[PDB]
Amino acid sequence: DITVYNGQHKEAATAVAKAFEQETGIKVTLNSGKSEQLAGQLKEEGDKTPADVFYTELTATFADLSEAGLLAPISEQTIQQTAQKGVPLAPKKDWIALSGRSRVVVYDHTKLSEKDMEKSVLDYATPKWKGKIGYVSTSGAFLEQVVALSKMKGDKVALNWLKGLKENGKLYAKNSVALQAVENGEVPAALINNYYWYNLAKEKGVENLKSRLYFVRHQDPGALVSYSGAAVLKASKNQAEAQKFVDFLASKKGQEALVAARAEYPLRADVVSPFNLEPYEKLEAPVVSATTAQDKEHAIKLIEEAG
Ligand SMILES: [Fe+3]
C-alpha cells in the first residue's frame, strides 16, 4: 500500500487511486491539501516523510523538491508516454507531467461569433472590449497568465495588459461567477479556464448553454496550459509500488480514469476525454518556464501596480 500527498482536485485523485486499487489491489491513502504546503512539508520531513508519491495540479511545485534532492528517478519509458511536443520534462527525470488545464475565452455566441474574437489575449484588454470582458484578478490561473506574459513579452506588456483590464474589463470574484455572467448576458466574454465550461456543458447539455469557448492557439500567451503531474519521493521505502503508481498514471488506463473524473487534457495521444476536449496538440500551447515563488511575487506586484 502507498501514501500519496495530493495537491490535485480530490475528485481526480480519488478516481485514479480507485482505478489503481482496482487494477493492482494496492491500496492508496490520500493526504489531500494545498500543493505549496505539501511541498514544504515534504522538504521538512525529508528522509522521514511517509509520502511515497506527490500528485499535484502544478508541476512547478516539483522544481524546488527536485533541486533539494528529494525526488526519485522515474522510468524514461514512462516519461515518454506523455512527452508530446510542448510538454514540460523533468531535466533529472524525477517527475512527470500527466495532464493539463488551459486558459480560454468564453463568449456568448448569441451576441458574438469567432469573427469578434482576437488573435492574442493581449487584444482583449483594449477599448473595443470596454465593459465587455470579464476577468478574475484573484484567480491562481490568472496569476499564471501574468507570469507567462512577463516571461514571453516582458513586464511592460504585462503591466499594460493589466492596466487595460482595469480600464476595460469587468471584475468577477471567481471563474464560476464569470462563466455565469457570460451565460446570463451580463458580459459578452470572459477570461477563464477550460474545465468550468466543459463541466457546465456536461451537466446541463451544450444545447442549453449560450456560451462557447474560443482558443487563441498559435503559441499566444493566452493559449497557456498549466500541467498536473506526479513524482516519487526519494525517501520512500516502497519504491516498487510508488513507481508502479506513477507508471499507472501515465498508462492508458490511468489517463482514462483521470479524464473521466476531470476535464483536463490527457497527455497520452491515445486517450480521448469524455468531456469532449480537443487533443492537447491542437491547443498550440506556448512553452513557458515553471513558475517560481519569485515569479509569483513579481506578478502580484504588477497586479497591485495596475490598480
Ligand atoms: Fe479553478
Side-chain angles (χ1 to χ4, degrees), residues 1-9 12-17 19-21 23-26 28-30 32-36 38-42 44-46 48-66 68-75 77-84 86-114 116-118 120-201 205-206 208-236 238-243 245-280 283-295 297-300 302-303 305-307:
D1 296 352
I2 62 163
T3 289
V4 172
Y5 281 15
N6 171 44
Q8 177 63 278
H9 197 137
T14 306
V16 297
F20 183 66
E21 296 171 327
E23 184 65 15
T24 63
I26 302 158
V28 178
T29 292
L30 300 168
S32 296
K34 288 218 296 249
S35 287
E36 292 170 288
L38 292 164
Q41 181 171 350
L42 289 166
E44 193 282 312
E45 286 171 346
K48 312 294 179 257
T49 189
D52 299 304
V53 175
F54 184 26
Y55 184 66
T56 182
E57 90 285 17
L58 291 162
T59 47
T61 312
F62 296 137
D64 191 64
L65 299 180
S66 181
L70 296 172
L71 301 184
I74 58 176
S75 163
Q77 305 304 313
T78 294
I79 284 162
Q80 282 306 316
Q81 313 279 9
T82 60
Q84 293 202 44
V87 170
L89 301 178
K92 296 165 61 187
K93 283 76 140 54
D94 59 358
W95 54 264
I96 181 171
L98 296 163
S99 62
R101 305 172 303 283
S102 177
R103 298 296 290 170
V104 74
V105 177
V106 65
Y107 70 98
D108 178 349
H109 79 155
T110 72
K111 290 179 197 324
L112 306 172
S113 77
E114 296 201 353
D116 302 299
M117 300 289 106
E118 309 288 350
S120 179
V121 72
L122 289 175
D123 301 324
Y124 291 92
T126 52
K128 161 180 166 185
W129 291 95
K130 190 185 205 333
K132 296 188 179 184
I133 186 69
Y135 67 100
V136 185
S137 63
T138 60
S139 135
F142 180 88
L143 193 67
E144 290 294 288
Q145 179 70 96
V146 177
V147 172
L149 282 173
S150 273
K151 289 181 176 171
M152 295 175 68
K153 309 291 191 176
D155 279 3
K156 309 313 118 192
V157 168
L159 182 60
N160 185 63
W161 185 67
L162 292 169
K163 287 185 185 329
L165 290 178
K166 174 58 171 57
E167 183 180 335
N168 294 299
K170 266 187 171 167
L171 176 65
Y172 293 106
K174 299 158 71 158
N175 289 317
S176 64
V177 178
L179 177 53
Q180 286 304 136
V182 171
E183 272 299 322
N184 290 334
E186 303 177 6
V187 71
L191 310 180
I192 63 170
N193 304 321
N194 75 289
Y195 52 86
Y196 295 97
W197 188 87
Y198 287 103
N199 283 166
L200 187 64
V206 72
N208 308 317
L209 296 196
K210 297 205 244 253
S211 62
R212 293 295 184 275
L213 294 181
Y214 173 75
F215 293 80
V216 288
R217 309 177 201 278
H218 308 238
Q219 297 177 153
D220 187 71
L224 187 73
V225 169
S226 297
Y227 299 89
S228 304
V232 177
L233 282 306
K234 191 177 282 178
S236 174
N238 189 4
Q239 292 287 324
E241 292 193 331
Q243 296 286 346
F245 183 65
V246 173
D247 289 350
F248 177 80
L249 298 173
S251 83
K252 188 164 166 158
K253 186 131 201 343
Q255 290 266 305
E256 286 172 346
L258 185 270
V259 298
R262 186 94 172 142
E264 293 206 12
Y265 295 89
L267 298 183
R268 282 185 78 89
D270 59 10
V271 169
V272 168
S273 172
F275 289 87
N276 202 212
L277 304 185
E278 60 260 89
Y280 165 80
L283 296 181
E284 299 178 354
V287 171
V288 182
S289 71
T291 296
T292 62
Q294 177 192 343
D295 293 329
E297 290 174 17
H298 185 51
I300 281 163
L302 284 186
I303 290 173
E305 182 170 8

